[model samples]
Target chain A: CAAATVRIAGRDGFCADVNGEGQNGAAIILKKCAENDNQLWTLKREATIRSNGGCLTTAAAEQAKAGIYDCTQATAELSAWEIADNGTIINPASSLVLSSGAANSLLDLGVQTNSYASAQGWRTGNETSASVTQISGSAQLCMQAGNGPANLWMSECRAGKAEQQWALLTDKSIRSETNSDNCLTSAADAGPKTILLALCSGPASQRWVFDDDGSILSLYDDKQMDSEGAAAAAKQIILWWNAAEPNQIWLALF
Target chain B: STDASYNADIKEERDAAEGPMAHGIPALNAGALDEARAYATVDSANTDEEVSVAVDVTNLAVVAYRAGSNSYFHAAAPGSSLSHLFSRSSQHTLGFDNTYGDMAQAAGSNRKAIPLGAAALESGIASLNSKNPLARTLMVIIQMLVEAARFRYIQNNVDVSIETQSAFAADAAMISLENNWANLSALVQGSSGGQGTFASSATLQNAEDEPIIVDAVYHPTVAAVLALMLRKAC
Candidate 1:
């Protein structure tokens, strides 16, 4: 599964999203599965099952919970993970399997010897190629674009539609698959303007990079995609070039 | 405000209200009091799924379903957000099936979990509202009286949840109008009050799981309407 919808089974047969689509600080939960990007995940090397624009990370020291955070900045001790032979999602640092206790509420890192360890076995697959999802980060907003001048806007994602489906291409460009030739591009070196769509000319303006720290790189401006002012929906996603800001950090819907 | 922040604000109010008013409440079996306690006791001490112990979910709730086994399990957000793909019919979008709760945990007992389930909250609240639409004003007044009576019974118990506080507060005078008043006085005050005032706009609430108090001096004047709402309360 490309950008696989990585998941682990919890004690009660529920699915696990180690930090269900919240920010880095949010804890994991075993929720009933849904088509939401919040629950989707992508398993990478180190058995890092990434989702919500962050890795299936664990603050392994805390037995109470595991959470999602920027793997780039996270410590190896906190972020290291593996899929055990028993199909458990294990955190090597803590030697605990990702688990949902018999109560099936919180998803925590538990000892492998525990009786419910078998429930940590995960079921993973790729997300639908292009579908609606929230771009994770401090913004916690959905992505949107249109036919012309209206740049990509970070807005409240409610009852969203095809307009939000985006294909993260191998060429490092985010394509609005809903639009044939449209790619996510900056309006200009204009600091923090709306991120708009331009014809795919392979121009540097359209070039972008999704960094491990969970920020999108805008080649034209040497900046990052930032959600504006922490405003509610109706805020335009702009290029702020700022680093280490939560607004700039984005969770990918793989 | 974002729903998260809005939720946060509700919690703040709940913490404040639950302490003074609800601490004395006793073995309240159901309704707004139960919701109030769930919020007051949410365990968000650390980074984890905040929880409340001893929650009785006998009221309708949302849960996941596995058609193959024809079995249902407790769902955190039984809607499309976290359900398994049993098949096209098992689309999570058709979430918060009331039947799942009926099927999954029959003879429900106290369970430890977060008080959430947007769908279940809606359904439960709806059941209360729909059960006595014509008598909503009287229904709420009785509920407030019942709620307050319980508050006096239990000592050192936690108060209601945030959303409930905000919702009740938003009503302005519903609680103060009836809170801690003797049933008869509360009833007399209620009878003289605006019918729209008893509209309990909200109870303990969140982005998920979706409480009150008052005593009263008994008054025969309200016996007629009170009899009506109480009969339909279940």
Candidate 2:
């Protein structure tokens, strides 16, 4: 089984020293990075990505991408989060599911769409040396032919495909080559409180970080990804400023 | 003055003997009586100036009485006797004293003074009607009523023995002056409207035959004020 380590970066443009090597962030550890049912996250046709233990993940498809995690130097807490087959990552106990059913599609949640199927599902693919290089940014994980619109297609994670891999920038913005639009944005005041999708501009809704305890803290306002509604599989959840309430906390374990 | 007093005493004795003196009297001092008779006959047929003076004096008296002046008592008779007849002084004195004596006879007599003075006032008002027969007759009637009512108190107390006769006379004079003023006020108000007839023909006849015309077309304010004055006067 091939393993991959997704290293978070700091303001110095270097891998964040999660092991306390002068940096204060943590690394996202994946058990097996190769194409396996647990490693290959399929954004289901119902706009929800199922992970281990029937835990639901954000679709992360198009404009309505999965809720991305970020990091900040304000609190300096090591936060981390990941997607699994049962809708939750195994190590960190956090459940940020896409709430509701297909009726509560992210598209219906004011998620903008550049095209008709811009808000479908996504998958990971094209690994090199145990690290996902050319990531399949398309909604379909299986690469089904004629399954969706052409504008929804994106290169898979590959070594040389800049459109596939993404790097968390020093400003806490997410940069995905396939998604020319920066995926994450800091809030209007650059406060570490809220992280929202920057499908277009760097709106306050998209800047986030993951803590060692798996809390998805928003880099903009230092909020965390929380269980929005009833925690059912395929339920949608998003990042929010921490209020110490159950609604503001999440348990994302497989 | 001595002869006048002697004549008064003789007349009083005769009046007492006869219970009441007759209307006619024989001349006691022929020279003086003849001259008086000449003046009387001549005065009866008033000259243009005499007629004007009479009307003016009568009108002034009415006005003075309405204005509450006792000076208008001069328009009544002079001297203290009530037997002097036909003399301007005697006539006025008789009329005024009769009115006052009648009023003091009883409270009813006092109450009756308002209407009696009102009648005498209306009689005097015919002079105005005579001047302008076509003018508002009712206006004259109401003006006369107001003037009489204004001076009713003075006329009622003209001979009251509660005070000296001079003081009473002074009061009467003031009341007559007030009567004049009240009459002037009524004239102003009455002339503003059309003439009106009285409710009774007797009142109309008395008003017409008299020197003043008192009708109902007088101003309501003047009439109302006079009525108030009458209420307080008696």
Candidate 3:
């Protein structure tokens, strides 16, 4: 919590954002490790990640991009998100959960809209002896990879289990010990967004870095996973690859 | 320059096609290959409904040759030796091009250029068989046919470059043809491609011979790519 650098699970990579003088519509993407102020962020009491006075907001109309802008003219309390008790990033704007997608998936609509996937929960930070589960309806399940070229799934939590034990690498890629060479990923396609399991190929899709502003960047592709169409539970997430749109940003609710 | 642009390679391929064009039966590589049907073995075992045009493009070298100081196309000539045919076919040969220009800079090019004409293939194969029957040659042709049909089948698939394709062909040749499956690891080794990208569909009746599929086309690099995927989808 000192430096406030958010990270993905397996590869342990940090979310280093892109360039553009931090102006309105300035692009944001996932950058490996951290580089000075560009990568440093602050998760404040207001449920937002702030840095150098700029607040990360879902600042747009497609719900596909996020940016730093006037906090007084804040985007919306609805776009603000937080990592809940069970580890899932939840936004009151859309009652859906964030799911792992194939490489290149953005936080904005890369998931199935209006639906909650069992795979959408997170463990936050790194693998630990404690199990983390996001709440779905009234059930709690651990995030786990299903099989080869695995997809994320909500399975019964067994605190000491393998797939359920999440770890992060230097690149912020999430992986479980037993699953070597494989990592959690999502894609940036426009089709039905689904959580996927893939190889650790260093593609933008495989890396997940966090922003203090709460919005997570997919390999710094200027996009993040979001569900503008999500409401209630069971909604899906989607990514727009380099879409510097607004709906993709998430506010850290830690 | 060749780093990401296949067209750089692809444009060079098209240079030869711009010349005077004629038609003839392109000679093939051997006597009777293991039957054209064996090239693309279809099976439901394949998941995702994907199919590979697995083939060995090096086989095409046996059919045609590049043009010499004279402006015409070249080959090993019907009565010549075929032992060194595979090496000379692609190396000392004319490349293929669709004469396509203008394109994307990020993704590499997939435009195919003409390496051997139908008659040229037939002539080269005739000459090759006259001395030796290339074992890997048949599988190569079968793979290309599958690829051409596959891309044409999918409405908007990515451009599977002739360079990438031939690299697969050459990689396959480096492995034993009979146990190519064991060597199939080569396909996904370099690229994190999907497993079984080498599956194939049933070969439709060629209904003719020489360039078996009638208007069957050959692009200089495509010979290698389609020599691409294969039948054994385990």
Candidate 4:
């Protein structure tokens, strides 16, 4: 069974990508976020990050560079990763963490001899038009666009509830099925900024990116849309730094 | 003029200390007891995996110290103190007496360097009985590594009058012991919340025994740059 395709965004709002947009020998790199097949990834059952019919891999060498290799040929030593709540993709065999270089540089594998940097951190979320499910809670908790004040919050997922379904668009806007013009927008760069729905203006605030570990991040501040409590019914979602906590991870499900 | 020969010798020794000396010798602060098992050689009597690792750590410190000295080849005398291993060339009396103090403790303020030797290490190990096994094991590993660096300094250049030679020992000690001090500090904090004796002891003092206390490893802003220095010269 294929899991929902997700986007993995790194520091400076860049997304993990195949240099040639998806090829066997493509170097996995950080690039300006966009809606491309190379930027879309799925978390497979084997702890592998899969895209372009291959998995995220680091060769079994000292400090190997990360890239895409055949999923079938990927062993835990080379492909399996532990997506930490703090957004670090850790490989147990090498005691190394997945790290990104500059925007266009190849992704790196490094010893986390120090604290995790934003470069080594990633946030994951759904890549399509679907119900955004709170990962650490029951699958029922869905992100909703509220009425009247038009607040953005979490609510019990009810199929066909127009406000509950969202489309992660090519333009990098999260548009609601109820009214496509109203986009998920941020009020400021510093959080906890209360996430609100405003007429989509395509400013930096309305541009959100997905991560494979399930973070919907506001490009304005790189903070994720968070549910205040675990499955707290109708808790308002606000922007918070991705502490790699579960409250920030959301799955987009059709 | 630089004694390129001494620099070359110490570099080889420090490189060995950063792991890859043998199939089982792991990098310093590799963060596990199982990783320490590679140091158990046939000549070692303790052979207890943790003890074996500790003994080699001390052995490597002495070995590195001797390698840097180039001329001093005497075996560790029976009554000799390992204090030289934890002290600075400028402050040989500064030792592990207060290595267990908090981060707020000045480097050498309350502590006094005692003449620690094989017996003291044995006594220290005996007294190291605690509930946190990982913390206990790392305590020995770190304490031993620090002492190893200081020992290298004393054996190699403490009495040398040449300014360049002194500078060489100072620079080498920082790489071998202090740069990794942050990493070691992170390991202690990561494993045991900076608890137990050895963790506290190593945190308070550094190779130079400077009164200033450095930030814990990976204190966010400082360590990314610090790790760049942590990489080998090659």
Candidate 5:
């Protein structure tokens, strides 16, 4: 089967895991080989893939919330996700795990053993090119990919670095930087999606995405995150999806 | 002997009236006449001695009249060199006659000759004629009016003939009569008696005391009217 073309419903909706075990414990995981409406997906010409219920699914297991991501939406409409030469995957429509490149860079710097280490990267290409590189490797970096103050890493290529690289996918869920894990997952009660990152031992509280443009969409309760400046350590990075909000959007070049 | 007493009494009267009164006469005494007859062919026209005696006697009579001696009337010789006594009396009459003649002529010419219209003039004449009188005051008023008319005639270059002069004098007398009576009326109004005399020298004195008021009362109307009549007669 053609690598099950994942689709996201509208701007921020569900994502389908092509491989059932890709990101375990995430919502919208692929279960059986049956050609059910959940598995049989078609990519619409407008870059949105609609299932029989008109909801698109992402290749990652976690799916974005209902109005989080879609190709038919404006350029700044999609929530946080991962896109690079490796492949593009939508993240769940959550604000905590999905952060702007600058925010993720700060977070990565905080979590890394090296006190101010660079981790951000970006992909090089037009709509068709597919090479990703760390900002530290190249002088000509993407506009959003740069090493800013304090050894903070920024994206020049799309390597699946949760802190460095991102993508606005067909589904709204932002895939993990490792590609082996889903940065967002369903909470225990499965009320809403949540963040699960490398720093939080993959807890559901860390999962996030972007919606309403610059706003961080929380998968925890499917609400946007609020600003938590000093108290942000060990706290989820989820934020409310406000397209105009500066704190929730990643400064990245396609 | 009766003729001698008559002659003595006549001599005494003649002595009293001889100087001023005789000066006015043109005739001589009987004694001087008889003495002139002895001189053959005495020219009557060349009588300087007689003229001198007559002038002297007239002067004496004027003085006597001033002295209030009316006894000379019957005592003085009628034909003495002092025959000017008769002439003096006749001169006054002649002055009055001349004034009356002018008045008659003015009346004939203007056809409106009348006595002074002022009540003061009438009353003043009556008061002077009456026993209870203010002669000094009345005389002053007469003098002022006559002098004023005289001056006014001289200023206007009017002919001052004897008749015109006499008329002015008469008009002055009439003004005096008016003012004297007006003063008497004022005094009467101020007091209970109808007769009151001016303590000052004359009506002129009282008039001068309140010059402006008196002028207002007399000048424009009465004085102006008299001035007009005199000027016309001149």
Candidate 6:
């Protein structure tokens, strides 16, 4: 399954545990797997794992205990977790996987203890599958990827075109069907901001929620996906204040 | 005045106007002037990609796209030479002395007017009369030139020995004219019944050499327009 309830334990029989009752900022330490809720985590489709609504994160300090943070408040680099094909749950930001020695030992970032290190192993399970779909907003014009490195614009909806097909992931990330790693991202630039296809980096800018109101909203800012001007082919897609207008509301058709 | 004396008087007037308005004649500060010249080409072409790159190179913070003209412009931010007097607190065009408020009926919380948009330009064009078009267009270009010179003067003190207030005015005028040439050309052709020859009109004098606003040999079209202005002034 893309998401599952799992416990990550080291070779020393110590499980990666939440120090407190899974509170925000709770330290992730090595403790006996008591089969409690705090010992289990939800591995999200995005590069993150959460327990009790807090994402696993690490401070900039090299030796600091890995902790849980409110996902919305954490930056991209801190919350990303990549469970490697080798069964090692890695924090790419620190280039370290979770390792343990004894019970009650705070989880610290460390290298793999051995090539076949049980200290860094976990049942990472199956990879999340992606669904390709067409997204359209005002005038039913589809969001089309441009030939340029990162340009996105509105075009006539066409089926099966690689430029119009987007993989809607379970994590609310919209990735280009042609290049799974490149996700639809709002440029961090100022107003009249351009929407571009960028490599998924776990930034809030890359996360979007298709709201019940039919609006594809950005988590970074509350701005909604909008057609720059009058709805027409070749018009640029931009992030704008949500007036709930036709331009801001979008529909996904698989 | 006799024919020879009348010709010489007109020559003095034309020289006075063109001396401070021609490109590369004064040649005091060539580098910054050349930079402005390059920017003029980009602004006149109205390409979005070029406009975006030019904005970055020019250090301007605003990109005002005119969807109507299919043109893009680098808007003048507050505190820049390209900005209007009151634009520091509002959306204003430096050359036109116009202020644009919120687009809709009232000033809403998050919506404010932007300059150089289609609506703003349409309204500015609507405000001018047929007779006033040529004079108004020239005045706006001249205003932009003066502002550009003032900007350079305050920063680098260029041409301080000559026209301190008008230093680099010619270089800036090159851009201003290119940017506004489309509109000016239309007006000139319309008022002259499509012949587009202002040189033949007796209302103005033909000064020695071309008007400093343009290089007559290569830009006879622009030179003729300036020729008419000089003739009328004399």
RMSD of each candidate relative to the true structure: 23.8, 52.6, 23.3, 22.1, 69.1, 26.0
Task: Mark the regions of model 2 whose C-alpha exceeds 4 Å error after superposition.
Answer: A1-166, A185-196, A199-205, A230-235, A241-254, B1-234
Model 3, residue B126: what's the lDDT? 41
A71-125: candidate 6 lDDT, tens digit per residue = 9999887788765323345677767666543323554434432232333444321
Q: Which DockQ value does candidate 5 get?
A: 0.00
TM-score of each: 0.30, 0.17, 0.26, 0.27, 0.20, 0.31
Better of 2 and 4 by TM-score: 4
Per-residue alpha-carbon lDDT of candidate 2 for residues A67-177, written as tens digits (9 for 90 to 100): 222323221111233332111121132233221112121122212221111111111212111111121111111110111111112222222434334433322333454
Chain A TM-score across all models, in listed order: 0.44, 0.27, 0.42, 0.47, 0.29, 0.53
lDDT of 3 by residue, A1-254 (tens): 11232322212232325353556545444444334466554544455655546766554466434456666777666435555322244555655444434323222212222222223333332121111111111022345566543765455544355555554443345555675467667764656476567767655456554432224555334455554343313333455554444444332110
Leading candidate by TM-score:
6
Quality class of the docking in candidate 6, CAPRI style: incorrect
Query: Tens digit of lDDT per residue, candidate 1, span A124-196?
Result: 3221122222344453456766344346675544424656556543234567756645677666666555667
For all candidates, state DockQ relative to the true structure: 0.02, 0.00, 0.01, 0.01, 0.00, 0.01
In candidate 6, stretches whose alpha carbon ends up further than 4 angstroms from where it belongs are A1-127, B1-234
Candidate 3: TM-score of chain A is 0.42
The number of clashing residue pairs in each candidate reads 34, 113, 105, 14, 89, 2
- For model 5, the chain A TM-score is 0.29
Q: How would you encode candidate 2's per-residue C-alpha lDDT over B1-234 as one tens digit per residue? A: 122232243334222222111111111112222222221111111122121111111121211111111112222433432232222431322122213233234223232233322223233345432432212222223222223233322222221211222221122323333434434333323322111212211111110122222322221112212212110000
After TM-score superposition, the amount by which residue A55's alpha carbon in candidate 4 deviates from its true location, in angstroms, is: 1.3
Tens-digit lDDT track of model 6 for B1-234: 122232243333233333232211211122243333323211211122111112211221122322222322223332343342222232323222211122122222111122222222233333222212322322232222222222221111111212222322223323343344334333333322112112222211111122232111111123212321211110
Model 5, B147: alpha-carbon shift in Å? 99
**For all candidates listed, what's the TM-score of chain B alone?**
0.20, 0.19, 0.19, 0.28, 0.19, 0.19
Q: Quantify all predictions' global Cα lDDT against the true fold.
A: 0.39, 0.26, 0.33, 0.44, 0.26, 0.44
Q: Candidate 3, residue A70: CA error in Å?
A: 1.2
